[PDB]
Subunit: 96 residues, 2 copies
């Protein structure tokens, strides 16, 4: 549950937008957990190894910047196990 974040950019059929990729490597080898962006409607992140990484429909949430609360969008990678889903949320609402 000790987790790392990266700026990467993403694609919607639309559409493109920057964001926050939270991910983890093991041992050893690397795999991304969730994506957090300013904008809805994204479908994919491009990730050795170039990877096609597909997101779930985002789950929206409020967050507090000193320029008004902005709304952020949270995209889990497909078929993430509930456990790591949890881990995400855990970390998320933990950045305060």
């Amino acid at each position: 549950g000790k987790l790392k974040q990266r700026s990467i950019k993403a694609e919607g059929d639309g559409i493109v937008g920057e964001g926050k990729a939270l991910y983890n490597n093991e041992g050893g080898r690397t795999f991304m957990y969730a994506f957090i962006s300013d904008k809805p409607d994204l479908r994919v992140v491009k990730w050795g190894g170039c990877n096609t990484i597909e997101l779930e429909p985002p789950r929206k949430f409020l967050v507090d910047s000193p320029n008004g609360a902005q709304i952020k969008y949270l995209y889990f990678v497909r078929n993430l196990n509930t456990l790591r889903r949890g881990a995400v949320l855990g970390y998320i609402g933990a950045t305060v």
Copy 2:
């Protein structure tokens, strides 16, 4: 996703000891998620009316400090759902 904590005290068939409880209130009804001591072998935490919280056999883990590094023990309340389990670990490795 959002957790809050509290110093509380715990019992075991052996004896007694102290630590930090990770909990999150249902609104406004308060829910205990897991317990982090410094000692193994604890089985219960009494609880907004008092209550019996059964602990799971603790999961050892490692953390730094001014006295060196430290063996910590983390006890999940019995029958937690996997989603909340993950949230804990998320919070856990977040707090740094």
